[PDB]
Amino acid sequence: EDAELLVTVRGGRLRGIRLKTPGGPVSAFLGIPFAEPPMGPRRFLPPEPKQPWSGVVDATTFQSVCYQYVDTLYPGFEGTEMWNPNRELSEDCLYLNVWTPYPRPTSPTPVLVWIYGGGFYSGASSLDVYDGRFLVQAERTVLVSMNYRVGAFGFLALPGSREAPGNVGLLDQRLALQWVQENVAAFGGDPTSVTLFGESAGAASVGMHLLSPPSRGLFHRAVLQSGAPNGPWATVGMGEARRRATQLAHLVGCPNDTELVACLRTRPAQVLVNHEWHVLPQESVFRFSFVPVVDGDFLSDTPEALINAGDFHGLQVLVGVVKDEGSYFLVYGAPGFSKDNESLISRAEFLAGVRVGVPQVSDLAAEAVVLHYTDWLHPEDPARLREALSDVVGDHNVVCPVAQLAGRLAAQGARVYAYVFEHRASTLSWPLWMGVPHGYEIEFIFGIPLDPSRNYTAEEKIFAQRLMRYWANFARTGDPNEPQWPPYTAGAQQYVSLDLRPLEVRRGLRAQACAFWNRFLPKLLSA
Amino acid sequence: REDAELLVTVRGGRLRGIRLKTPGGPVSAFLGIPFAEPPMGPRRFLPPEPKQPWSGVVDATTFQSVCYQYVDTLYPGFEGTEMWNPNRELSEDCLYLNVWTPYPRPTSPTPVLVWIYGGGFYSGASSLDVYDGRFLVQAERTVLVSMNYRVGAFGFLALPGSREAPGNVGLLDQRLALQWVQENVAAFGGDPTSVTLFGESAGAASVGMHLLSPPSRGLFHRAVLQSGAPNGPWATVGMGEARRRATQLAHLVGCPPGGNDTELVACLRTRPAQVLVNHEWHVLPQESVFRFSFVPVVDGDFLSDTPEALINAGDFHGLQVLVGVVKDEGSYFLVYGAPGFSKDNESLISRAEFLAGVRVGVPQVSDLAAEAVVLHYTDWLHPEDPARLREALSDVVGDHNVVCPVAQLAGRLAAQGARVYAYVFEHRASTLSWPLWMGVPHGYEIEFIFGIPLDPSRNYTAEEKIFAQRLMRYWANFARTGDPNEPQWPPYTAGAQQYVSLDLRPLEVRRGLRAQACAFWNRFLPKLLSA
Ligand SMILES: *[C@@H]1O[C@H](CO[C@@H]2O[C@@H](C)[C@@H](O)[C@@H](O)[C@@H]2O)[C@@H](O[C@@H]2O[C@H](CO)[C@@H](O)[C@H](O)[C@H]2NC(C)=O)[C@H](O)[C@H]1NC(C)=O
Ligand SMILES: *[C@@H]1O[C@H](CO[C@@H]2O[C@@H](C)[C@@H](O)[C@@H](O)[C@@H]2O)[C@@H](O[C@@H]2O[C@H](CO)[C@@H](O)[C@H](O)[C@H]2NC(C)=O)[C@H](O)[C@H]1NC(C)=O
């Protein structure tokens, strides 16, 4: 046997697998159980630690994906299938994965922990684009990723109730981080150098562990890619969370919270998924049914309030966005949009799209959005309207929440590094009009262009190696440098552009637009 | 004995004029023609009565008195301010007009330009050196008329509903002057069927209110509005606010010692004119710039609705208008109350002074509205740069009070049948005494329209004399034909939004009268104040 693939953790023994990369072998331990399967009576309940096992757990292949909706907008299209589950769906899905150099490190190695995105309703650590083999070989870190419950199974909340308290998907992540603290040294990892990174809802999850004290002691640095806990989509209030959970029960034939949750636990998992989207209050894009709830427990206040009231001295954070955060979501409900044509919409379609992209706001608020995003010298140009409503969705949901997080963190003691990812992949399968869409920096952070079986250019392989160096440098030292990448400050607002060209320093993360979302709109909605 | 060309008979009687020298030749001037009975004593605040006929010959040989008004003392002796102050004695006996005609008098009917001065409805006079009509008449061979109208409380104090002080009598003064033109301008060689109103600031606002009042609409055919509109936030006032200001002015002068309107007005009528003027500014609701105490009141009479509503609902086919602004409409007004501002230093204000100035420049709006102003006019990459903040507050005041009101008027008129031409005046006069940071301030295109640079005693450059002659040609071409052209000046439309720049260079066509900023003032901000 290969002694390098045998590991004993607190719960028992594991057998791993040796993987190949163009730069040499790596050790992988896939499908390690870290929680008891949240089946039957454990549905909706907080996770509990996996009990010890005898024998050797086979950790050579990925485990099941947590039960989730499957996208059917473009069947067979790679641009959407790459995010769909690539393993069997199951509620028995609380497993994590460890990648480590081969042979395993003998001295403590910095740890990167990946939290996937997918709007709190989808995602899996087994997706090809999250393959940790290249980061580990190239930068000699330990990479851990976990699966956490999504959809109703992870975030259905009847606030106050104990049968369905909410946020258990976040607790799945916290349990995995506790598992890392207790077991990563057995793989060569340093439990005192843990860097969280995630994208979208994963980035939102990273930020929520930053604002929940029981999680704060489980890591030391944070990376937030195209997401933040303080957006309009990553949290929901107790009242609306209760309305959605109650509505879901009605749609599946269920009836007192105890009796309500009791009935929901009798339904097949696929039945809950089939009605998940129908509990949203209106037509929308960039909105998801079951998300973290602000109930005073995991989050003792709104993330915005927790960000403004925090002392963040001693914290290093890496945040950033892609060039066109909004484009991807427009084909999921904005009238006039799809991947198949130029999406050259009209004024009427733009105005209708604003109510879809900014749902659940007063008409006056919507008019304010139209004022700020209309070019009143070209109020009806279709190309400008397409770009503008992409800006509306992208700034409202990603860029401006990320800009607000960065500004307040920097102004309250944290050292912040900000980027804008501006390279359109040569292999990109979405249309040109989408630009650099949400989620298409990940494959470069994970070094997927180094895979010889794929068709990335030579330049793109070099660019991926740069990005892996920045990310790993930040994990080791809190700084990606060593042309310089300067810290982001609330005044200078400096960031860098990441593309095939060398680093270029710029000012302002859509500062004009984000003054509207972050400073003026909250005042308007309050009056 | 007598010169037959300086003798004219109008309906009221005979007149005697004078022969004026101009650099281009002689011009006949009939200055100080009475067109109303003096609104003295019992007639204070009352509508004007037509001048009763007279026997003998009235000497119309010099400008008459300036209507009683506040005299500005901000920079005593400074040319930039003294040029707007009265250059004749103050008197309530001030309802006189002036006619300039070519020498010899026209053989055939000649198009008429009628000037309405500005001054915030509280000041002004047709006798100001900058309104001298001799150069226009000589250069372009039109007849030019200008009238005095009552300003301040004497022209616009309103107790709505009462007949002792109904309000808007200053506008009735101009209407009577326009009526006089219809009945008498032919005696000077003028064509009563080709009459073009033009005015600046409150004079431009007055021109617009004649457009929206049917009884005046039949007295002229074309309109020119310079740096002013009837629909701005300063040109009109509501019935209740007009009565509150009128009642408080009376209270401040011992009247009564509110109540019955007749006794209130009769008490006001006993007060010396200067006593009313001394308290005029104290009735304003708050500290502000670009706000004036006694302005036209929307009472359903002269204006059956707000100028906004009358504009949006009006049919303007068959009308030609010429509208425009100068490059820096807001700067002049900042030194009148915005913190940090002076003509004598660079006025490089702080962020705190900028936020304070927003409330002074946009008075009587909710805190949310003020926050919306700060959002649009702040550069969030340079939120505290003093120079940028200075230009920003100038824009706030200029867009809110002039540019966007003019832009809305232009767009609605064009969309509803009118033919409109728009300009932006971009030349800073070589003789300008205001500091450089003010740019091209409000009011300083008038001297070029009137051909003042042709005066030998002044020191404009030769280029400026050509520039003035070209501007006079545009204005007269519009008066004669409804088209300033003959490089072209295209009409203004709500879509293309084309206008020309007026400076020493040839005409350049551009798009949008501050389209982004005025979308905020004209489209969004009203929706916010309604909620
Ligand atoms: C661009 O495409 C959209 C999407 O339409 C779908 O995809 C196209 C490639 C084609 O297969 C269409 O027939 C599909 O419906 C068009 O928006 C739709 O237009 C039709 C009427 O033409 C309407 O019934 C649908 O409801 C529209 N979809 C939405 C979400 O509003 C759009 O018209 C196309 N633009 C063009 C052709 O210029
Ligand atoms: C620019 O000038 C203003 C106006 O102040 C007047 O003009 C100055 C040139 C100088 O002669 C002052 O003494 C005059 O009072 C300055 O603002 C004033 O500042 C003083 C004290 O600092 C204050 O009492 C006044 O209220 C201010 N006036 C207003 C209208 O706010 C301003 O400070 C000058 N800017 C500089 C010097 O940078």
Swiss-Prot record, chain B:
Which tissues and organs express this gene's product?
Isoform H is highly expressed in erythrocytes.
Show the disulfide pairing. 67-94, 255-267, 404-518
Q: Return the CDD domains for the record.
A: Esterase_lipase (cd00312)
Tell me a GO biological process for this protein. Answer: positive regulation of protein secretion
Task: Write out the residues that bind galanthamine.
Answer: 84, 200-201, 332
* Chain's role: Hydrolyzes rapidly the acetylcholine neurotransmitter released into the synaptic cleft allowing to terminate the signal transduction at the neuromuscular junction. Role in neuronal apoptosis.
Q: What is this protein called?
A: Acetylcholinesterase
